[PDB]
Amino acid sequence: MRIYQCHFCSSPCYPGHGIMFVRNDAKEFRFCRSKCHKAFKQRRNPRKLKWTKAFRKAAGKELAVDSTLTFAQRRNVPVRYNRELVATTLKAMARIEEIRQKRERAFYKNRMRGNKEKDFLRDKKLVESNPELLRIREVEIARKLAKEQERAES
Amino acid sequence: MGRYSVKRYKTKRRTRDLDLIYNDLSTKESVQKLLNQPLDETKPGLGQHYCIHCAKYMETAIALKTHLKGKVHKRRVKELRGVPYTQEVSDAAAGYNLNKFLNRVQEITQSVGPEKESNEALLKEHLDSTLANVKTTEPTLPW
Amino acid sequence: LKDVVTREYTINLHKRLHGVSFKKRAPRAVKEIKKFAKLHMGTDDVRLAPELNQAIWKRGVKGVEYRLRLRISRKRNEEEDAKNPLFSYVEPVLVASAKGLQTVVVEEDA
Amino acid sequence: RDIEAENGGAGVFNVNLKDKYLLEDDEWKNDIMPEILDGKNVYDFLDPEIAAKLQALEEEEEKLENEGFYNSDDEEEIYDGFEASEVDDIKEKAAWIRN
Amino acid sequence: SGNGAQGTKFRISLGLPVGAIMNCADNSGARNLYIIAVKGSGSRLNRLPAASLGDMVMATVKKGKPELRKKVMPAIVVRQAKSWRRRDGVFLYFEDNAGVIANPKGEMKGSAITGPVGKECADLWPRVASNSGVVV
RNA sequence: UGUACAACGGGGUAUUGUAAGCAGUAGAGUAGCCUUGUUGUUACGAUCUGCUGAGAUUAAGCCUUUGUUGUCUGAUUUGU
RNA sequence: GUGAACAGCCUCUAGUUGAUAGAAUAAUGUAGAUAAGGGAAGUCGGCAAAAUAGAUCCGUAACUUCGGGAUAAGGAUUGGC
Ligand SMILES: [Mg+2]
Ligand SMILES: [Mg+2]
Ligand SMILES: [Mg+2]
Ligand SMILES: [Mg+2]
Ligand SMILES: [Mg+2]
Ligand SMILES: [Mg+2]
Ligand SMILES: [Mg+2]
Ligand SMILES: [Mg+2]
Ligand SMILES: [Mg+2]
Ligand SMILES: [Mg+2]
Ligand SMILES: [Mg+2]
Ligand SMILES: [Mg+2]
């Protein structure tokens, strides 16, 4: 029993989910879902479709190369059996996932660094234009004060 | 789907794949094997006048000449440019077999890339030399 | 107490027009708005503003909005008040968006 | 064939294939591999010296942490040399304008 | 009755009715095979006999060598193109319908099979497995 | 007459495929001007990039709710 | 306006908004549609539907009353700036 990766769309494939196409070279393409599979059949580009991990890595929205990503390989030469080694692997998996999520959040917080300065600049330009729309606001606030206070006077 | 994509992309109407055509365009011996085809009764130009990028057979040689001038061929040539998107790209995008994919990428930018480009250059000048003073009618004689 | 009252509501027409024929989607929304006002104010007599009718029919017969913000106000009738001394009057409030808004009571200063 | 005869028939006797493993311990012959943990395969991570690799990873991680770009607390706002009160005022006024 | 097949065959989705053209996947000299009967099929009013991957059929040769034509021969279906289910759970399909020429005892007439072979066919027929280099 | 019921609102779960707006040493080239230029400026220019897996939709027979606002009527008949 | 076009499709001037209505969404109909793998195995009979289709360029057989057949057959294309 194995979890596979979607060929077109890079999502996990669990047992009983999706479809597989066997090409004439014994190359097997497993598909996440009918959306990823039909995009394959219509021959669309996965590096061009924006909702895929291939696009996100190639465009630099996600971190692509890291020491935490050098751990899951296809292991073709097996080791015998060792209860202690299995327990160490099961601990190291959780530690590795924790480190990887921390580094991914750090990558996002670095690439989203200018979204306070840009917002202040557009807000100050909008406020610096249209002065007489700010006098309607000044009249509206003073009308909200006096009408409520004489209603609170009652 | 509806009707159009069902009519075109049906499994018994499937066309060849980009990474297979990329491995065809590498290895100059494979280019000579694809240019010097035998006679075949079920191919349009008796197995001759074959475009390697757009993996289709032409009727005449003047048909191949106008196809090479056209705009569908330029779309396929622009598609067959960089790293050809195998399953290794999907695996490494998921975070798996990443060192193997990195070896593959540096290998294709070191060795197989300029070889493919030099074969494609030689093939373009050879086809432009051959398809120059060709008549429009064809001798049906298959020798 | 005080059976004369005004409130602002938002009605979700998208889940009330699900499956309806295209030539009848805008005539059905008028009936659903009257049913909504009858359920919320208890009144059988409901009157719609023509500006609310314009807001309903603004995109043709099959292009009704998903959400609408309404102002409903219970009032009193006049001479020959048929069988009902109260009636509801429904108006539109043209807001920026109709999403993310709760029911509010309108303080009347008139 | 004899054990199969005295433990049922031919299509009845169920053979233990783990009964001839060559392991270091003999309480280990009837264990099972975990095979899946969260969304990952255990066979993808199972290798010797994974303890050494995780040691190198955590050493690099604490070195990176003491240089410190894990500073989530990062307030170096130099907006236009404004102060936060009139910054808040400009924000609420521009929100009013676009509404 | 079921001659040459080692063991039993479980249920697989049938793809090829009587009257279908499939490819010939060995080097015996044929190009396509026209399916005229299916060995070991049930009887029902109005229902066509249909073959799936790993079945012995009776076929004729339409295109190919001039000696092979105008005679009826046994064949075995090795690629299906209609999606069936593996019991380790995935649905899967090939690119084309394809089979090889055989005698009634299950032995093969050619010497090698081109392209992949379904593992159910290769597990059901031992002489198919000995002549194929790619099994799915 | 109370984790009572409903209308909205929130949170999940799902579908699509990157909103409007603003910006740019991005952009085949063509014009205008200074000192015809070891990216000369400007003006147009399909398209591209960033803010942005964004925006929209989500029960109408999806799941869940420490929120807001309201309501909790009335008719008919039956006896050994 | 599009377009070869008094074709079809959308709009201005002018004119109409008439034809019993309301609520639901069972079966069977009438008028339309889509369908994996196969491709006439269906039927008296490819009935019906699908497929083709404008324009540019290349190319086009038997036969013939030499005028035709002929858009024979077959192929490469088409946006925006
Ligand atoms: Mg319906
Ligand atoms: Mg909700
Ligand atoms: Mg945008
Ligand atoms: Mg984006
Ligand atoms: Mg014109
Ligand atoms: Mg016209
Ligand atoms: Mg079909
Ligand atoms: Mg027939
Ligand atoms: Mg018949
Ligand atoms: Mg019959
Ligand atoms: Mg017909
Ligand atoms: Mg004719």
Tab-separated table of N, CA and C in Angstrom, chain C residues 9-49:
chain	number	residue	atom	x	y	z
C	9	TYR	N	-32.976	44.087	6.966
C	9	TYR	CA	-32.754	42.665	6.793
C	9	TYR	C	-31.933	42.432	5.541
C	10	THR	N	-31.321	41.264	5.458
C	10	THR	CA	-30.766	40.771	4.210
C	10	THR	C	-31.404	39.427	3.890
C	11	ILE	N	-31.945	39.314	2.682
C	11	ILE	CA	-32.601	38.101	2.217
C	11	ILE	C	-31.689	37.426	1.198
C	12	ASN	N	-31.617	36.097	1.278
C	12	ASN	CA	-30.808	35.270	0.389
C	12	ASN	C	-31.733	34.674	-0.667
C	13	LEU	N	-31.775	35.303	-1.839
C	13	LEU	CA	-32.651	34.865	-2.916
C	13	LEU	C	-32.086	33.699	-3.700
C	14	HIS	N	-30.795	33.416	-3.533
C	14	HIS	CA	-30.136	32.372	-4.302
C	14	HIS	C	-30.664	30.994	-3.933
C	15	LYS	N	-30.878	30.742	-2.647
C	15	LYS	CA	-31.421	29.458	-2.232
C	15	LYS	C	-32.939	29.409	-2.281
C	16	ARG	N	-33.600	30.498	-2.661
C	16	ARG	CA	-35.038	30.494	-2.885
C	16	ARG	C	-35.412	30.434	-4.356
C	17	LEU	N	-34.494	30.770	-5.254
C	17	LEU	CA	-34.745	30.664	-6.683
C	17	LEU	C	-34.044	29.475	-7.321
C	18	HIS	N	-33.627	28.497	-6.528
C	18	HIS	CA	-32.913	27.336	-7.036
C	18	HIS	C	-33.851	26.452	-7.853
C	19	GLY	N	-33.544	26.282	-9.136
C	19	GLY	CA	-34.289	25.399	-10.006
C	19	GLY	C	-35.413	26.030	-10.800
C	20	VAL	N	-35.665	27.322	-10.637
C	20	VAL	CA	-36.830	27.982	-11.215
C	20	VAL	C	-36.564	28.332	-12.678
C	21	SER	N	-37.615	28.255	-13.501
C	21	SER	CA	-37.541	28.575	-14.921
C	21	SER	C	-37.165	30.028	-15.177
C	22	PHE	N	-36.435	30.230	-16.277
C	22	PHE	CA	-35.763	31.493	-16.554
C	22	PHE	C	-36.753	32.615	-16.827
C	23	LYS	N	-37.900	32.299	-17.425
C	23	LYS	CA	-38.919	33.317	-17.638
C	23	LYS	C	-39.706	33.633	-16.380
C	24	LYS	N	-39.491	32.903	-15.294
C	24	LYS	CA	-40.224	33.120	-14.062
C	24	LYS	C	-39.349	33.472	-12.871
C	25	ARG	N	-38.029	33.610	-13.042
C	25	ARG	CA	-37.173	33.863	-11.878
C	25	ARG	C	-37.400	35.248	-11.274
C	26	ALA	N	-37.544	36.278	-12.090
C	26	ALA	CA	-37.848	37.600	-11.539
C	26	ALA	C	-39.297	37.786	-11.072
C	27	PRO	N	-40.333	37.198	-11.702
C	27	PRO	CA	-41.648	37.215	-11.037
C	27	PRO	C	-41.736	36.410	-9.747
C	28	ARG	N	-40.898	35.389	-9.547
C	28	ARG	CA	-40.964	34.609	-8.314
C	28	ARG	C	-40.343	35.342	-7.134
C	29	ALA	N	-39.379	36.226	-7.392
C	29	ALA	CA	-38.693	36.907	-6.304
C	29	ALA	C	-39.595	37.922	-5.616
C	30	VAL	N	-40.564	38.485	-6.340
C	30	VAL	CA	-41.537	39.396	-5.743
C	30	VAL	C	-42.410	38.659	-4.734
C	31	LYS	N	-42.883	37.473	-5.115
C	31	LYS	CA	-43.675	36.637	-4.222
C	31	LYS	C	-42.872	36.152	-3.022
C	32	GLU	N	-41.590	35.837	-3.224
C	32	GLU	CA	-40.762	35.418	-2.100
C	32	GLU	C	-40.480	36.568	-1.142
C	33	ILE	N	-40.346	37.789	-1.663
C	33	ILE	CA	-40.120	38.946	-0.802
C	33	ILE	C	-41.374	39.268	0.011
C	34	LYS	N	-42.557	39.109	-0.593
C	34	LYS	CA	-43.795	39.298	0.166
C	34	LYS	C	-43.967	38.233	1.244
C	35	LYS	N	-43.611	36.981	0.934
C	35	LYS	CA	-43.646	35.907	1.929
C	35	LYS	C	-42.678	36.168	3.083
C	36	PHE	N	-41.486	36.682	2.767
C	36	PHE	CA	-40.481	37.034	3.769
C	36	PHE	C	-40.976	38.133	4.703
C	37	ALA	N	-41.562	39.190	4.135
C	37	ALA	CA	-42.065	40.291	4.951
C	37	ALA	C	-43.268	39.869	5.780
C	38	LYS	N	-44.097	38.966	5.249
C	38	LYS	CA	-45.225	38.453	6.019
C	38	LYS	C	-44.754	37.596	7.184
C	39	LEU	N	-43.712	36.793	6.972
C	39	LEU	CA	-43.175	35.982	8.059
C	39	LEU	C	-42.503	36.838	9.126
C	40	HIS	N	-41.879	37.944	8.731
C	40	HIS	CA	-41.127	38.707	9.719
C	40	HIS	C	-41.964	39.754	10.440
C	41	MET	N	-42.994	40.308	9.807
C	41	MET	CA	-43.800	41.316	10.467
C	41	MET	C	-45.195	40.839	10.826
C	42	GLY	N	-45.594	39.640	10.399
C	42	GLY	CA	-46.918	39.142	10.689
C	42	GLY	C	-48.036	39.795	9.915
C	43	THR	N	-47.725	40.605	8.914
C	43	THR	CA	-48.728	41.346	8.168
C	43	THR	C	-49.096	40.604	6.893
C	44	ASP	N	-50.383	40.629	6.557
C	44	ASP	CA	-50.836	40.103	5.279
C	44	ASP	C	-50.696	41.122	4.158
C	45	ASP	N	-50.853	42.408	4.465
C	45	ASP	CA	-50.747	43.465	3.469
C	45	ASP	C	-49.303	43.937	3.391
C	46	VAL	N	-48.666	43.684	2.253
C	46	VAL	CA	-47.291	44.077	1.982
C	46	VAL	C	-47.299	44.934	0.728
C	47	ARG	N	-46.600	46.064	0.771
C	47	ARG	CA	-46.457	46.942	-0.382
C	47	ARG	C	-44.985	47.133	-0.703
C	48	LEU	N	-44.637	46.950	-1.967
C	48	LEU	CA	-43.270	47.078	-2.441
C	48	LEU	C	-43.076	48.420	-3.120
C	49	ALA	N	-41.906	49.000	-2.932
C	49	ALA	CA	-41.573	50.225	-3.625
C	49	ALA	C	-41.233	49.930	-5.086
